[PDB]
């Protein structure tokens, strides 16, 4: 028994349409055959197509487009359908579907002109309704509507490679764990020995003023040079608090609460990072409330560290990769690092305007994808390392804080099939089109540059 | 290492009970959730605007193709997608001649120019809605490019195009409202000064001011620039288009069609996996810059159940902003009133009180506000307060390849704090929704007891309920995404007393 519906069309074009009508017809109970849904690329398809036209097809639909009227396969299928129509004496065996507004009725094959085509040009819904009316008037066999079948076919055929697949993925983070801490946190009771107007940020080692005390991991003698009044200070007057007890939450005394000690340790980590950055001779860029550190042009051989470029060019302006770090303790004692891009005119002198920096950063980062960000961050962090495994944040003459150069790695159990990066380039090109609705206030600074 | 859990992609329900992951695919294959008779479009604007609108409708009645059909699927046509007619014939048109626009467009004061133009448009819309026998489902405003360019808070008219000078300065106007007591028979000059000072009561944003002034009349509105619809006709000095939309024509048609269908009374889609008796509330805060007290702010709450069709409640205006912390908090009485209104609206709609209530906010809740919330929650209802913030950056970089981390991966710090990736690679689109490396949102359960994985799934699902733009997913849940827009619209005017509950008037 002939109960199938045949939709003939072009492969590269006439692809999106066939999909809509086919799914729509199958969802309405019609048994439909089209090479998009039932043909696996690589097999000799002509024998199967000829068999389905000759043996199982009741209505033959040909999509009449500009490329449909010239494609060789469409013409062969139409010839087979014409032979079958002559055999069956069914003058309505071939039902044309006109979808191209530029296809005149004289450009349609002379065999197809005599058949009343269904107007899909103006509206696809009206064409579908006309097709359904014609099918009802011709008693085309159909089953009760089951849209689940169309949904299942869509998911199986056009979403096979477009689903999350199970595969372990290792993700590098921007959290760099702290291997060790100094044994004790010390509160030196300097009182008068510390003038009330002394800026503790000028000390050679991190320190914080807390009441009449000085909170640091460093010893009393580490500040004799810069605070000569502390030469006569007794070491037994210091309140030494174990760091492990602070971090583990077991520290409970009336002198100071545990969260205050953790906050002081965070501030000391930040100060040690600032001093380490000043020790590495990296420039400073003042952000809203924190500092970003970037590398000056010509500091690194060919502006590259381990074959990774850190200083480059962007039109007439130069871009620098920079990091800004803040200490964290709660999830785990890590050193949080954020990535920044900082621009200069000649490689040394900063750009004073903030909106120029913002626009240039967005423009440069649009073309920087996962690999570029990860490689540049890792290269920067390995630039700061003192050995192969960790970077040392000096906090005292004998006390140091060790931070690994290997980020805290994360792993997940679900992955994706990696496509071509041309999609990434396309999204980059398309980002500005969407951003033209929110970036109409930064267009004056660009004219200010010229 | 630290383990990442995976949250499956939330499916959304469509017509005939079929579920899909992409709104475009579901709309194209099965259609919207509910069908409407049609869309009776009303247009206010220039004659060129009406011609552009009619051309755009005639264009979207027929399919529009994109270069890459995977990330941005084509538009099969309005009738083939939604099943309802959107004809360009029989359109209620209220013309705004170019002379009328030029009369008010060349005023030095941005506030006065915006107020005058918005008054023109709003008066036309109101008169048409009140005196015409033909009802209009959605009113479409075709704003000319000059109005969009010169009617924004930071827009300055060049000194060559200034024809009418400003009669009052910004500081002098800000120092008029609070010291009214004009107390006198005033020369016409002082009455014009008074009128301009009153225009200073409204924001300079054209779209937001028009929405705020049209809220009280329950008139849906869609605001479209002329170059959004006919971008080929708007060329710069070099001959190239000012805005090149040749690559998102299908996406633009999808967005405009979905917005128009939603505003006309139809619901396009809804969540496929629904938890019965669950109600999400989005606590929204916006500062009133026109207040005598700098701490004053306007508080709003938005209720969503399974679709994007939400309910908006406007709270009272009072000193909610805390300058020392940069956090907003309601006093007990106002919090109780807001939550009682939300719960009573839910009881009216669904005939029974919700089983679970989730309040999403951008700041932590204090004990006073939470006790106020609990005093009005029924004993059989679970109340949970969740804060979603983007300020805690945990950037993960995939070791191999240039593509970012897949959407849906989550990191659970503890029973109440977790990281969720609403941005990243999407297997269905075979591309990424965010540039550079996506920023996860930080999800924290401060108050109440609730399982963290269920909250993550609910937030990922709520990400799918943006009816203003037919995109696959947003960066934030719908309970918080429209916080800024709704706050700005509510605060654009100080004369809004009883705004409407329906969500379609705020976007």
From TrEMBL, chain A:
InterPro entries: TIR_dom, Toll_tir_struct_dom_sf
Molecular function as annotated in GO: metal ion binding
Top-rank taxon, per record: Bacteria
Residues reported to bind Mg(2+): 442
Keywords: Metal-binding
Pfam families in the record: TIR_2
Listed Gene3D superfamilies: Toll/interleukin-1 receptor homology (TIR) domain
Single GO biological process annotation from the record: signal transduction
Protein name per its UniProtKB record: TIR domain-containing protein
Organism of provenance: Thermoflavifilum thermophilum
From TrEMBL, chain B:
InterPro entries, A to Z: RNaseH-like_sf (IPR012337), RNaseH_sf (IPR036397)
Keyword Acyltransferase: no
Domain of life assignment: Bacteria
Ranges annotated as spanning the membrane: none
Keywords assigned: Metal-binding
Residues annotated as binding Mg(2+) 2: 468, 507
Name of the protein: Piwi domain-containing protein
Organism: Thermoflavifilum thermophilum
């Amino acid at each position: 028994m002939r109960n199938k519906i045949f939709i003939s069309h072009a492969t590269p074009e006439d692809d999106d349409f066939t999909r809509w009508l086919s799914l729509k017809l199958i969802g309405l109970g019609y048994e439909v055959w089209c090479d998009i849904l039932f043909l696996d690329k690589g097999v000799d398809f002509w024998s199967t197509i000829e068999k389905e036209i000759r043996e199982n097809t009741c209505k033959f639909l040909i999509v009449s487009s500009t490329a449909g009227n010239k494609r060789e396969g469409v013409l062969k299928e139409l010839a087979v359908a014409t032979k079958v129509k002559k055999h069956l004496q069914d003058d309505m065996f071939i039902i044309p579907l006109a979808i191209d507004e530029n296809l005149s009725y004289d450009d349609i094959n002379i065999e197809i002109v005599r058949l009343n085509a269904i107007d899909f040009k103006k509206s696809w819904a009206k064409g579908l309704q006309d097709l359904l009316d014609a099918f009802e008037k011709q008693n085309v066999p159909k089953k009760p509507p089951d849209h689940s079948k169309s949904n299942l076919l869509y998911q199986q055929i056009f979403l096979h490679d477009k689903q999350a697949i199970e595969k372990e993925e290792t993700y590098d983070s921007n959290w760099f764990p702290i291997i060790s801490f100094p044994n004790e946190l010390r509160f030196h009771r300097y009182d008068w020995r510390l003038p009330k107007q002394f800026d503790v940020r000028t000390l050679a080692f991190p320190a914080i003023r807390y009441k009449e005390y000085l909170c640091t991991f460093a010893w009393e003698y580490d500040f004799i040079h810069q605070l000569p009044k502390t030469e006569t200070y007794n070491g037994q007057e210091s309140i030494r608090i174990s760091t492990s007890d602070i971090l583990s939450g077991r520290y409970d005394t009336d002198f100071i609460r545990n969260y205050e000690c953790q906050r002081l340790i965070v501030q000391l980590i930040n100060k040690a990072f600032e001093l380490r950055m000043k020790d590495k001779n990296v420039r400073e860029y003042q952000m809203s409330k924190t500092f970003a550190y970037w590398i000056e042009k010509g500091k690194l051989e060919k502006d590259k560290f381990e074959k990774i470029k850190l200083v480059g060019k962007q039109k007439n302006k130069y871009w620098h990769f920079g990091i800004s770090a803040a200490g964290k303790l709660y999830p785990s004692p890590v050193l949080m690092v954020s990535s920044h891009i900082i621009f200069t005119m000649d490689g040394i002198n900063l750009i004073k305007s903030k909106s120029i920096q913002h626009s240039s950063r967005r423009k440069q980062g649009k073309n920087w994808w996962n690999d570029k960000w990860r490689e540049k961050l890792l290269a920067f962090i390995r630039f700061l390392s003192d050995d192969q495994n960790a970077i040392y944040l000096n906090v005292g003459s004998e006390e140091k804080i060790l931070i690994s150069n290997k980020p805290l790695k994360f792993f997940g159990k679900m992955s994706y099939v990696t496509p071509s990066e041309v999609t990434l380039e396309e999204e980059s090109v398309l980002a500005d089109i969407n951003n033209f609705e929110e970036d109409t206030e930064d267009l004056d600074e660009l004219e200010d540059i010229e | 290492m630290k383990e990442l859990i995976y949250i499956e992609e939330p499916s959304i329900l469509f017509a005939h009970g079929q579920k899909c992951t992409d709104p475009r695919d579901g709309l194209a294959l099965f259609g919207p959730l509910n069908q409407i008779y049609g869309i009776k479009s009303g247009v206010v604007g220039t004659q060129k605007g009406l011609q552009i609108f009619k051309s755009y409708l005639d264009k979207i009645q027929k399919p529009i193709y994109n270069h890459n059909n995977i990330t941005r699927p084509m538009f099969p046509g309005f009738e083939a997608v939604f099943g309802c007619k959107w004809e360009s014939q029989n359109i209620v048109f209220k013309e705004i001649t170019d002379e009328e626009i030029r009369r008010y467009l060349f005023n030095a004061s941005t506030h006065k120019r915006t107020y005058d133009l918005v008054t023109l448009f709003n008066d036309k819309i109101i008169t048409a809605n009140k005196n015409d026998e033909e009802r209009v489902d959605v009113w479409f405003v075709i704003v000319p490019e000059e109005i969009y360019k010169y009617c924004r808070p930071n827009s300055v008219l060049p000194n060559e195009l200034v024809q009418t000078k400003s009669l009052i300065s910004k500081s002098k106007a800000k120092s008029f409202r609070y010291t009214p007591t004009l107390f006198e028979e005033f020369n016409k000059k002082l009455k014009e000064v008074e009128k301009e000072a009153k225009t200073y009561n409204y924001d300079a944003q054209f779209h937001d001011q028009l929405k705020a002034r049209l809220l009280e009349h329950t008139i849906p509105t869609q605001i479209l620039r002329e170059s959004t619809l006919a971008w080929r006709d708007f060329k710069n000095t070099f001959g190239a288009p000012i805005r090149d939309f040749s690559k998102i024509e299908g996406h633009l048609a999808w967005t405009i069609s979905t917005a128009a269908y939603y505003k006309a009374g139809g619901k396009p889609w809804k969540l496929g996996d629904i938890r019965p008796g669950v109600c999400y509330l989005g606590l929204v805060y916006k500062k009133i810059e026109k207040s005598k007290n700098p701490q004053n702010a306007c508080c709003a709450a938005q209720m969503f159940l399974d679709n994007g069709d939400g309910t908006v409640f406007k709270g009272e205006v009072g000193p909610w902003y805390n300058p020392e912390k940069g956090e907003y908090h309601l006093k007990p009485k106002e919090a109780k009133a807001l939550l009682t209104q939300a719960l009573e609206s839910y009881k009216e709609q669904n005939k029974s009180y919700p089983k679970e209530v989730f309040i999403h906010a951008r700041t932590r809740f204090n004990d006073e506000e939470w006790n106020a919330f609990n005093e009005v929650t029924p004993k059989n209802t679970n109340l949970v307060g969740v804060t979603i913030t983007k300020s805690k950056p945990l950037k993960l970089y995939k070791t191999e390849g240039a593509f970012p981390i897949m959407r849906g991966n989550a990191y659970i710090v503890d029973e109440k704090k977790a990281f969720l990736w609403t941005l990243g690679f999407v297997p269905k689109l075979q591309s990424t929704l965010s540039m550079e490396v996506p920023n996860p949102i930080f999800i924290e359960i401060n108050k109440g007891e609730a399982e963290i994985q269920q909250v993550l799934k609910d937030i990922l699902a709520l990400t799918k309920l943006n009816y203003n733009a037919c995109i696959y997913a947003d960066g934030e849940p719908v309970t918080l995404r429209f916080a800024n827009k709704i706050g700005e619209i509510l605060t654009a005017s100080t004369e809004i007393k009883t705004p409407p509950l329906a969500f379609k008037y705020y976007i």
